Amino acid sequence: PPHGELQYLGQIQHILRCGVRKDDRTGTGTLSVFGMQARYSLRDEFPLLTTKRVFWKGVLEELLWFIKGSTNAKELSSKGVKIWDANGSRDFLDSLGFSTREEGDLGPVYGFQWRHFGAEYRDMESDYSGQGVDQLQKVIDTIKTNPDDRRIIMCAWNPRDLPLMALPPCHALCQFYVVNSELSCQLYQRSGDMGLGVPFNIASYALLTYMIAHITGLKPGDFIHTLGDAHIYLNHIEPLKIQLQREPRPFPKLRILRKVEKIDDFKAEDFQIEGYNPHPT
Amino acid sequence: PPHGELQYLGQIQHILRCGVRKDDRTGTGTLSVFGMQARYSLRDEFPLLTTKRVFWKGVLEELLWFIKGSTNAKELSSKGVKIWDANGSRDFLDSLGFSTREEGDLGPVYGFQWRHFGAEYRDMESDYSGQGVDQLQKVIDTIKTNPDDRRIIMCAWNPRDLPLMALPPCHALCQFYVVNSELSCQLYQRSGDMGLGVPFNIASYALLTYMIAHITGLKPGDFIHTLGDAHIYLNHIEPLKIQLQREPRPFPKLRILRKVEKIDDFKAEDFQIEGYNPHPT
Ligand SMILES: O=c1ccn([C@H]2C[C@H](O)[C@@H](COP(=O)(O)O)O2)c(=O)[nH]1
Known part of the structure; x- marks a missing residue:
């Protein structure tokens, strides 16, 4: 059995060999292919890429952030993760026509x-309890009552x-599947920077699966x-080629110290990555 | 290059060699695999499976039916396509608790x-002009003014x-990609009946791509x-083994004989599947 990270590296190799130039919103040139797929096993190991360090703290905290239903970047920032603060900036909002929102209000993200x-939606601090659908809980509820169900879907795309x-959203929708008391999850990313995003993303949805598996008594x-659009920035092509020569170190393992029963009851301390020996850069 | 149909056949061979036993809502039983992807070229050919005939008449009519915005099964019925009549009977509706809803009203599909x-949504007779988001037209619009856009999506999944x-809906969402004048599309299908279903879908959406291509001036x-959940029904196991031995016939070529302006003014007459040579059914 070949190391799982090989699929990811292969996808990069494929972008280079078969990709074409495509400009982004800012006009910057990239190399991309449309439609790709990789399968990462979550059995006795976590797919936290080793050919380059992944911002785990960001991964874990941000997820917990999504679970709380928070739409205030400040709440995530106060945890040491600032990846969302940019969009919560005062002047940033004004240029989008949200001069009325406070700093941190990201909207219905x-x-x-x-x-x-x-x-x-209205304010990053209004009461929404009882409002709309709680896809997350529903997904968990379905896993338990009807595991054969083929509608275990959580869509973030709200036209x-x-x-x-x-x-x-970059992560349009994810689907969960149950068979032989095993939990699998497929994620649909409409676009992904193979060098910066994808790795962080793989972790996120792998972590989420572990959680829901743990909460539902599954493996x-x-x-x-x-x-959707798998791309690489043209200027990063060289660094990437260097990375593509690195040999993947065996994947780390994820361990949930205490036992949890509800999804919202998960805390940053509940988890711990062990054996994460990534390459330096 | 190899025959595109091999993608599909290959996936069936895989599902047979690795699909695990899994049931459905009816508890019927089928071999299943979660997470598959196939690429079909639309260049100077149309992926209309040949190792088994496809209900083209149905595909073409059903699509026009979707575009129209119709939610009445009687519409597609009155064309020689009743595939949606079943879910629109006086019995099926009551079954689901829609006594008020009158025969035909499939709901907000x-x-x-x-x-x-x-x-x-009120009913299949209500006037929705100037309501909701016209995803179809918006997609067309974006492809025309900003083809590099990585958000070109049509989501049919409304929690x-x-x-x-x-x-x-079996077809959660679809994303369009444009590069080098060529228009591409990807479909996310949560559940897929490899036997009679996937072949039909591969066509439905390939046609959608061609149509949108034509009105946007792209190839x-x-x-x-x-x-997502790719499966082969247990009974279909045999009928398929024979099909796997049938040599694939060169894919036909769609022909849009008429210059259509908008997506709305399209007709079944506007198309022609040239040289379509299926296999004995
Ligand atoms: O988790 C994340 C966070 C950010 N991006 C970034 C990488 C791409 O450069 C960017 C593209 O944004 P759009 O141009 O598609 O809006 O999304 C991800 O893909 N995943």
Whole structure:
């Protein structure tokens, strides 16, 4: 059995060999292919890429952030993770036409869509309990009562809420599958920077699976990663080629110290990555 | 280059050699695999499976039916296509708790989610003009002014309307990609019947790509079919083994004999499947 990270590196290799130049919103040139898929096993190991360090703290904290349904970047920032603070900037909002929102109000982003889909958004601190659909809980509920179900889906794509979001979601929708008391999850990313995003993303949805598996008495199965626009920045082509020569160190293991029963009851301390020996850069 | 149909056949061979036993809502039973993806070229050919005839008449009519925005099964019925009549009977409706809903009203399904996403659904006779988000037209629009856009998406999965639907959409969402004048599309299908279903879908969406290509002045590129729960029904196991031995016939070529302006003014007469040579059924 070949190391799982080989699929990821292979996808990069494929972008180079078969990709074409495609400009991004800012006009910057990239190399991309449309439609890709990788399967990462979650059995006795976590797919936290080793050919380059992954910002785990960001991964773990941000997820917990989505689970709380938070749409205030400040709440995530106070944890040491600033990856969302940019979009919560005062002047940033004004240019988007949200001069009325306070600093931190990201809009109906991931958190909101996950637990209040369809609800009427307003303030990053309004009451939404009872409003909209709680896809997350519903997904968990379905895993238990009807594991054969083929509708275990959590969609963050809300055409209606798009104009109110700081930026459209990258993770359009994810699906969960149950068979032989094993939990698998496929994720649909409409776009992914193979060098910066994808690795962070793989972790996120792999971690989420572990959680829901743990809460539902199941064993993590596979994490399928489906991409829409798989790209690489043209200027990063050289560094990437160097990375593509690194040999993947065996994947780390994820351990949940205490036992949890509800999803919202997970805390940063509950987890711990062991044996993460990534390459320096 | 090899015959594109091999992608499909290959996936069936895989599902047979690795698909694990799994049941459905009816508890029927089928071999299943979670997470599959196939690429189909749309260049100077149309992926209309040849190792087994496809209900083209049905595909073409059903699509126009979606575009129209119709949610009445009687519409597709009155064409020689009753595939949606079953879920629109006086019995099936009551079964689901829609005594009020009159025969035919399939609820807020594809046509609705495609031209009026979000709009509060009343009934198949209500006027939804100027309501919800016209995803279809918006996609067309973006492809024309900003082809590099990585958000070109058409999502038919609306958690808020799922309960009001005669059945959850098998085609969660689709994303369009444009590069080098070539238009490509990817479909996310949560559940797929390899026997009679996937072949039909591969066609439905390939056609959608061609149509949108024509009105945007782009040439057909690739159609990436991504499956979630890919399965082969236990009984279909035999009928398929024979098909796997049938040599694939060169894919036909769609022909749009007429210059169509907008997506709405399209007709079944406008198309022609040239040299389509299936296999004995
Ligand atoms: O978790 C993340 C966070 C950010 N991005 C970034 C990488 C791409 O450069 C960017 C593209 O954004 P759009 O141009 O598609 O809006 O998304 C991800 O893919 N995944």
